[PDB]
Symmetry: D3
Subunit: 149 residues, 6 copies
């Protein structure tokens, strides 16, 4: 059903947390509709982080995402985006509820393992910028009935 864009920032990829962060959502019910390693290459960054470019963080923020790769993803299911952030954790890892990808694998707001949509609109603008339309498989997960109803 509803889709959501969420990727693993350079740090997590480097901290070998790719697998777990993917898995967390698999064993949750969220469905992986597309995912790859497309780097930010600066240009892709500035736009994505376009909001508040005048803020000092940009200088040191756009520096980060652009270093190592970025495993980008798109996940399905009802309330996929709503629930994602809940388990993604609070933005600040040193303030994020223990049990989340952040409160379990993150000690700094600078580079906190993953990233994920803050609304369906932000979701419907992130998928596009990073993915496309064909890179996404429209596979029906053989196990989805034992989740919704």
């Amino acid at each position: 059903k509803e889709r959501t864009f969420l990727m693993v920032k350079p740090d997590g990829v480097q901290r070998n947390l790719v697998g777990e962060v993917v898995k967390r959502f698999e064993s949750k019910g969220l469905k992986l509709a597309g995912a790859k390693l497309m780097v930010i290459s600066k240009d892709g960054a500035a736009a994505h982080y376009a909001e508040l470019g005048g803020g000092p963080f940009f200088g040191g923020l756009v520096g980060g995402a652009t270093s190592g790769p970025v495993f980008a993803m798109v996940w399905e299911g009802l309330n996929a985006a709503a629930t994602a952030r809940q388990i993604l954790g609070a933005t600040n890892p040193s303030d994020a509820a223990p049990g989340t990808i952040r409160g379990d694998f993150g000690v700094s707001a600078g580079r906190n393992a993953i990233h994920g949509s803050d609304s369906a609109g932000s979701a419907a603008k992130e998928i596009g910028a990073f993915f496309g339309g064909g890179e996404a498989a429209s596979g029906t997960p053989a196990a989805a009935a034992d989740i919704y109803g």
Copy 2:
């Protein structure tokens, strides 16, 4: 260093084993140079499974990979391909050493979670068919020194 192509067959994707199977190699040292959900779409299959197309299995084998998506990947490091198959497990999951992706998550030779190169040549022909050349990030993993020397 050496690269290797290895993907999660439709079954594992469906059995929610995407994360673990990725993670296994992260916590091993293997480096994820590119990865996405590009389906087999028949044509991509027949070629990949080209070997022994005259064998009856093809009828029922090419049927499998083509159902659900396929998380394809390319991994780095020394002896990446050599070691991969070792931990990938024996082909038959009901005969594969307990500790592997197969002997831990597989009961049938038909659909056994993942797939992975059987030699550097087979590796240097699988990467190409499924990936390309640009989809691969040439990121230097900040943690590779604590592995090799």
Copy 3:
């Protein structure tokens, strides 16, 4: 000490979460006094879900529990029932604290992995309906001293 009835609804059994959901309480301290796979068989349902039978959910709720099996259990220890629900999670999995059997393995209020008593009375009426009196082992766990005092 205090006992509590808590089972894994059809969904979790089907979602292969039997082991983890059992284990969660083992590594917590709760003691497994009896457990099996006794299906609801409709009659057993209607009574258990007797409360608010006039509510529309019953139509579609009693349909659920009755499909696949149900691993029923009874757990011991002080505050067993009080603490259980806390770690069982909120009723709604898309609203349940990340770290629980629900917020980690559930995306719908319809079928949320497990079920567990809401009070000592409800506990002292669920055990009976599903278990009996002899199916329960009165074993003294050799490791209980390192928990209470």
Copy 4:
């Protein structure tokens, strides 16, 4: 399909390994057709361990199983029994392949976490003695197609 009897000896129940040992087979594909906590109560022992009652071990062997409870189970699937012992591990835990329930959770041949059939006949005589015929659910696991074919 084929069924198999396998229980967790008193030790494992006490060592809180109930959950994991159950889970191992869930994430493998084996299907839990019935399971409870029926103690050995001596009589049930002597018969089960009937073979080589004249051997000194019986004195100290029948003493063991009869202490704490015993989570008995019956598992399904093709080659269920054949494969089970493989992942159950070698009889001697201080000689059992690392990755198994024994080589991971056992240091003595005396009490090694679990027990499991040594042949289909031994399987078709253990189920009966410990279970019955009605305690077993004939549920069709909604996820079995993504395993066999």
Copy 5:
């Protein structure tokens, strides 16, 4: 950076939770600057628990820590102490957020797996009493850059 004293009380050591409790902080980013098994030996206790010695708990509290060993540790990083207690969990395990060392491995306020500083001062007085000054390695963790910035 900032250091913090936190040990595993006798119970956890006995409950085999040493590894996990250590690991939790490793995969968090906290750095292990020194750690061993120095028992409380009464004298070391009374001082550490000096606060409220007139309270009845002391009788039964100092009895506890002094039984089995105690894996003491000192951890590094920014907000190490601040964040530690958050993931250490609430003092009462039957009231501590599920995801913590306490809410996951503890059912009694008496003996709750681990112990950890309640302020930088309390941290700068616990390290000393249990460690020294030379037992601490001043190693620079080759992976710290992918955490802070």
Copy 6:
């Protein structure tokens, strides 16, 4: 019972594998009689690696252990040393059975997570060099009866 010296080489400490590597033996039955972070400081190295100092590896081998810290340990139980190496894994991680600390967390013979005695004599000479005699707790693990007999 029998004791054994086994530490985590600089690499593993750096690769955040301290916890797991400790835990592996806890959930096995091995008892932690003492453990800390005492660095090799060259002198401690040369002696320990004294054997084959004339071999070229020494140049580049003694360089390794001396970089980051080293969590040294001493473990108890029957066949502690015999069984340890089995689960420690083969010396070469790219040849070590999948399920071990090496075959799961190691890709190079140079730096392979941990180290552990090759005989009771080598065990009775490693403990001494790294530990002492007082740093070891003679605690009786409250859970040892459910293992041996």
